[PDB]
Structure 1
Amino acid sequence: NSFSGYLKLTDNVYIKNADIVEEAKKVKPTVVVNAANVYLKHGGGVAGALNKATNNAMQVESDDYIATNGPLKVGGSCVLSGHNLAKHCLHVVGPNVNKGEDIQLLKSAYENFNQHEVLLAPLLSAGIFGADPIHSLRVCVDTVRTNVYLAVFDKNLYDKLVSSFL
């Protein structure tokens, strides 16, 4: 958990302009959060990048989890191995608002972070899931009560988030 170069936005939310994969390799946190889908198929966005950095070990493990437990619910999560990136990976499913899933479930998705004291995480539902990234940061700030270090890999978006937050 040796986080460097973060900006503190609130008592418990920190933000950095970095690829979450590079942060995980440098820090080796206790928990890295994945922005997953209900079948844990890590095909693109943050999920594809984290799985690629484990050389598909995350996908093989996720397929075994689904074989034994079935899919997650939207707003739900599971804890799996973090492989070479972290001790654990918290896979969290935010709503895919572009497919009519209710944005109210973004609060349920961020509530899963509260089971862990410290996490390295991305913005949920802000990739191909279509939610406004500044709205996603507002829900994170209003819902997460443990210590969360957010990595955002787009400088243009990082600057808009810091300006809107202060």
Structure 2
Amino acid sequence: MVNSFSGYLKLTDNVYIKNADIVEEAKKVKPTVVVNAANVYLKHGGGVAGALNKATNNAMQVESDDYIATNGPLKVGGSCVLSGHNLAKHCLHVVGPNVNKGEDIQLLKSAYENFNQHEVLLAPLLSAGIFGADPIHSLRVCVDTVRTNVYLAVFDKNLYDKLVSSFL
């Protein structure tokens, strides 16, 4: 399919980036898949997760609570596909490593590998916020791992400007 993604800078054959709120991009484009930067408990408190969940009027959290009750926590580096509610067809919840809490940064590659199961994704930079991975590192792992088409929404203007001026 052709989506209405607009205003993205090309990074590579398959990776595109924009200074935008992922919630607003999802609302406008209604992509097949929006990626959440989750924790293993799917407790969507802040950052991307909290903003996505609020935009679903808490439906994402209610669904997530049922998922955990049935299946238990995700693995670090793991994922699950749930509804995208009013934002997207699906939300791919992906758990990057919580580097600030001692988890292995190498698991960020495993996390991004989940994206390869989907032809097109709207996504954030995993682990680059409250989980404490260096943002440029997360971008480089994304570029070096994801082979499907990924549209990265970077909320923070200062960060975007730095990332797009950095080697990959």
Question: What is the TM-score with the length of structure 1 in the denominator?
Answer: 0.99
Any idea what SS the aligned residue of 2:164 has?
helix
CA distance in 2: counterparts of 1:154 and 1:56, whole angstroms: 24
Superimposed CA distance per residue, residues 32-69 of structure 1 (whole angstroms, 9 cap, x where no aligned partner): 00000000000011100000000000000000000000
Deviation at 1:71, TM superposition (A): 0.4
Deviation at 1:146, TM superposition (A): 0.1
Residue matched to 1:103: 105
Deviation at 1:118, TM superposition (A): 0.2
Any idea what SS the aligned residue of 1:163 has?
coil
Question: What is the TM-score with the length of structure 2 in the denominator?
Answer: 0.98
Give the root-mean-square deviation of aligned CA atoms. Answer: 0.8
- Identity among equivalent positions (%) equals 100
Q: How many residues are paired up?
A: 166
CA distance in 2: counterparts of 1:51 and 1:165, whole angstroms: 33
Unmatched segments (≥5 aa) in structure 2: none
Any idea what SS the aligned residue of 1:15 has?
strand
CA distance in 2: counterparts of 1:56 and 1:107, whole angstroms: 29
Any idea what SS the aligned residue of 1:78 has?
strand
Superimposed CA distance per residue, residues 56-98 of structure 1 (whole angstroms, 9 cap, x where no aligned partner): 0000000000000000000000000000000000000000001
Deviation at 1:142, TM superposition (A): 0.3
CA distance in 1: counterparts of 2:111 and 2:98, whole angstroms: 12
Residue matched to 1:94: 96
Unmatched segments (≥5 aa) in structure 1: none
Superimposed CA distance per residue, residues 100-125 of structure 1 (whole angstroms, 9 cap, x where no aligned partner): 00000000000000000000000000
Query: Is contact 1:9–1:165 with CA below 8 Å preserved after alignment?
Result: no
CA distance in 2: counterparts of 1:58 and 1:34, whole angstroms: 11
1:67-146 paired onto structure 2 within 5 Å = 67-146=69-148
